[PDB]
Design an enzyme around this catalytic site. Structure first.
Site, PDB file in Angstrom:
ATOM      1  N   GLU A   1       0.812  -1.213   0.000  1.00  0.00           N
ATOM      2  CA  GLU A   1       0.000   0.000   0.000  1.00  0.00           C
ATOM      3  C   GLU A   1       0.851   1.270   0.000  1.00  0.00           C
ATOM      4  OE1 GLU A   1      -3.084   0.635  -0.370  1.00  0.00           O
ATOM      5  OE2 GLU A   1      -3.553  -1.478  -0.623  1.00  0.00           O
TER       6      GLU A   1
ATOM      7  N   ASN B   1       2.072   3.874  -3.046  1.00  0.00           N
ATOM      8  CA  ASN B   1       1.820   5.299  -2.894  1.00  0.00           C
ATOM      9  C   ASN B   1       3.033   6.067  -3.401  1.00  0.00           C
ATOM     10  OD1 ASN B   1      -0.714   5.118  -1.814  1.00  0.00           O
ATOM     11  ND2 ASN B   1      -0.088   5.535   0.303  1.00  0.00           N
TER      12      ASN B   1
ATOM     13  N   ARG C   1      -7.650   5.063  -8.855  1.00  0.00           N
ATOM     14  CA  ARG C   1      -7.253   4.819  -7.474  1.00  0.00           C
ATOM     15  C   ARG C   1      -8.486   5.090  -6.587  1.00  0.00           C
ATOM     16  NH1 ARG C   1      -3.509   1.608  -8.418  1.00  0.00           N
ATOM     17  NH2 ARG C   1      -3.399   1.550  -6.119  1.00  0.00           N
TER      18      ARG C   1
HETATM   19  N1  LIG Z   1       4.306   9.021  -1.110  1.00  0.00           N
HETATM   20  C1  LIG Z   1       3.366   9.891  -1.456  1.00  0.00           C
HETATM   21  N2  LIG Z   1       3.727  11.042  -2.141  1.00  0.00           N
HETATM   22  C2  LIG Z   1       2.790  11.942  -2.504  1.00  0.00           C
HETATM   23  N3  LIG Z   1       1.455  11.863  -2.274  1.00  0.00           N
HETATM   24  C3  LIG Z   1       1.101  10.676  -1.569  1.00  0.00           C
HETATM   25  C4  LIG Z   1       1.956   9.679  -1.139  1.00  0.00           C
HETATM   26  N4  LIG Z   1       1.271   8.655  -0.477  1.00  0.00           N
HETATM   27  C5  LIG Z   1       0.041   9.060  -0.527  1.00  0.00           C
HETATM   28  N5  LIG Z   1      -0.151  10.290  -1.178  1.00  0.00           N
HETATM   29  C6  LIG Z   1      -1.413  11.054  -1.416  1.00  0.00           C
HETATM   30  O1  LIG Z   1      -2.430  10.545  -0.468  1.00  0.00           O
HETATM   31  C7  LIG Z   1      -3.655  10.393  -1.214  1.00  0.00           C
HETATM   32  C8  LIG Z   1      -4.191   9.106  -0.701  1.00  0.00           C
HETATM   33  O2  LIG Z   1      -4.098   7.844  -0.432  1.00  0.00           O
HETATM   34  P1  LIG Z   1      -4.343   6.420  -0.696  1.00  0.00           P
HETATM   35  O3  LIG Z   1      -2.986   6.263  -0.248  1.00  0.00           O
HETATM   36  O4  LIG Z   1      -5.479   6.159   0.180  1.00  0.00           O
HETATM   37  O5  LIG Z   1      -4.590   6.853  -2.173  1.00  0.00           O
HETATM   38  P2  LIG Z   1      -4.956   6.199  -3.638  1.00  0.00           P
HETATM   39  O6  LIG Z   1      -3.566   5.956  -3.828  1.00  0.00           O
HETATM   40  O7  LIG Z   1      -5.616   7.378  -4.149  1.00  0.00           O
HETATM   41  O8  LIG Z   1      -5.767   5.040  -3.001  1.00  0.00           O
HETATM   42  P3  LIG Z   1      -5.620   3.464  -3.149  1.00  0.00           P
HETATM   43  O9  LIG Z   1      -4.605   2.979  -2.181  1.00  0.00           O
HETATM   44  O10 LIG Z   1      -6.950   2.928  -2.827  1.00  0.00           O
HETATM   45  O11 LIG Z   1      -5.273   3.224  -4.575  1.00  0.00           O
HETATM   46  C9  LIG Z   1      -3.340  10.008  -2.611  1.00  0.00           C
HETATM   47  O12 LIG Z   1      -4.363  10.151  -3.580  1.00  0.00           O
HETATM   48  C10 LIG Z   1      -2.048  10.839  -2.835  1.00  0.00           C
HETATM   49  O13 LIG Z   1      -2.381  12.083  -3.438  1.00  0.00           O
HETATM   50 MG   LIG Z   2      -2.598   4.456  -2.313  1.00  0.00          MG
END
Ligand SMILES: Nc1ncnc2c1ncn2[C@@H]1O[C@H](COP(=O)(O)OP(=O)(O)OP(=O)(O)O)[C@@H](O)[C@H]1O
Ligand SMILES: [Mg+2]
Ligand SMILES: Nc1ncnc2c1ncn2[C@@H]1O[C@H](COP(=O)(O)OP(=O)(O)OP(=O)(O)O)[C@@H](O)[C@H]1O
Ligand SMILES: [Mg+2]
Lengths: 134, 118, 136, 119
Positions: free
Chosen positions: C46, C50, C105
């Protein structure tokens, strides 16, 4: 494609380390032998770092890098440990500084025969680096 | 802390049989060294037969522990025989030139025959 | 006592499986259950995803750094990111929120991390990077 | 692994697309699935999808993503999507995302086909 792995110098991490390495290299779809040599070589070099470079002190950290490119596996094992005084002497078949621990002095020889290249760089009290290529 | 290499030991008269299953590396070779030297202190062992049939891996730490065990057997005028050696392992016996000092057999019956036990 | 492992790798999706499996391997030393392991691998995946999709936009020249410091039965996991970051971290902490809908996402990432771990601390400064600390 | 780490199997039963998965379903792998499925939907008039997760080894949010994307595809054509042979691990994720409120679950392929009036 590149991977880097560090870990405390505990003998309990040796298998994990070489398996991790072999897993990353597997992307080049090697043979079981080709893999076997790599895992052995990794095991050979990592063990040197732990017993020689840190004298079985777990607080130490072994650093393994694996840069893969154009079918070539560029493996490096480093340690910021004791270092090697005479390297031209360690490179001597059957040479060892730990006969009390029953080390046979076959390490570099194995690495030499399994890899197309082996470069061992070192300065005393600083640590070391062993670069292998296949 | 033993599931990375299983060690099976059995004493047949003055012969110690060591059958290995798993990987034989630094960590692992040290545990082998301990159980074996231990048996050597408690019993008058002249010969050792090392069954490598189920062995999955071996490094220079494998040679080391074997070499140390030979010197122990040499001292009592004994012989050490390895059997069911895989190519990978056989290859390492060739570099170290461990063969010049360790007899190799097909497997455990022929090892025992070489030791005049069968 | 403690044992620690650190892993860095190019921000490519073919390394993800590799990374979580590697982490799960190290953690295995605490003889966890298949569920405990599954949650950690899910969590790693996860956070690593990200970094790769939301830091480096699928671009491989980026580097993801995972740290696993185990001590007194506790797993202290961390992830890095020298790529684009989170301008409104707290807002990202809002269930279902996502920047990438063209990439389908769902905004579960963090919700999953919070439910599988006893603790989740996300630090970040824009254009600098992002760091997610997980505990179990 | 170029589909190793996964393994996708597809079959159309009239207007129904069955997708059988074996392996891990993550970012890398969920993208390939998406590619093959959307490809079949363009080439054929598919109204329903049945997703067999019986042999699924792992799943992350990348797995939920590709599933919802497929549901919206199916939703517009007035169809239904059914997942079957779901392990607890995977069922758990359906509970958080609340994917269940939009995806029917069944014990096996046959019950998923019965739910779609095919059998
Ligand atoms: N390492 C990172 N760098 C920049 N932005 C991040 C990072 N990790 C998370 N984010 C931001 O946090 C928001 C959310 O999180 P989640 O991690 O729940 O997102 P998704 O990636 O949109 O979801 P999913 O895990 O269901 O695909 C993201 O849409 C992203 O913009
Ligand atoms: Mg995510
Ligand atoms: N990382 C290191 N730091 C310091 N000294 C080293 C290191 N690696 C190797 N050496 C020195 O080089 C000599 C060489 O190697 P080999 O690798 O042949 O040694 P052994 O460890 O003695 O043998 P074996 O592989 O049979 O256990 C060693 O005996 C040791 O003194
Ligand atoms: Mg050595």
């Amino acid at each position: 494609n590149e991977m880097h792995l560090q870990f405390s110098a505990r003998s309990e991490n040796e298998s994990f380390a070489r398996v991790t390495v072999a897993a990353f290299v597997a992307q080049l779809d090697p043979t079981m032998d080709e893999l076997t040599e790599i895992k052995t070589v990794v095991s050979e070099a990592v063990t040197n770092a732990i017993i020689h470079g840190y004298n079985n002190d777990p607080n130490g950290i072994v650093s393994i890098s694996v840069i893969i490119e154009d079918g070539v596996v560029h493996l490096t094992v480093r340690d910021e440990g004791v270092g090697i005084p005479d390297i031209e002497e360690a490179r001597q078949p059957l040479f060892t500084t730990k006969p009390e621990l029953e080390r046979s002095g076959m390490g570099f020889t194995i690495m030499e025969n399994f890899m197309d290249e082996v470069i061992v760089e070192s300065e005393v009290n600083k640590g070391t680096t062993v670069y292998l290529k296949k | 802390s033993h599931m990375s290499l299983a060690i099976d030991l059995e004493v047949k008269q003055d012969v110690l049989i060591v059958r290995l299953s798993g990987e034989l590396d630094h960590h692992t070779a040290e545990e082998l060294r301990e159980q074996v030297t231990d048996v050597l202190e408690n019993r008058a062992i002249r010969h050792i037969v090392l069954n490598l049939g189920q062995l999955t891996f071996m490094d220079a730490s494998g040679l080391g522990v074997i070499l140390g065990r030979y010197k122990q057997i040499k001292n009592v005028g004994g012989q050490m025989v390895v059997c069911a050696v895989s190519p990978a392992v056989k290859r390492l016996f060739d570099m170290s030139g461990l063969f010049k000092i360790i007899r190799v057999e097909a497997d455990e019956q022929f090892a025992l025959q070489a030791l005049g036990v069968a």
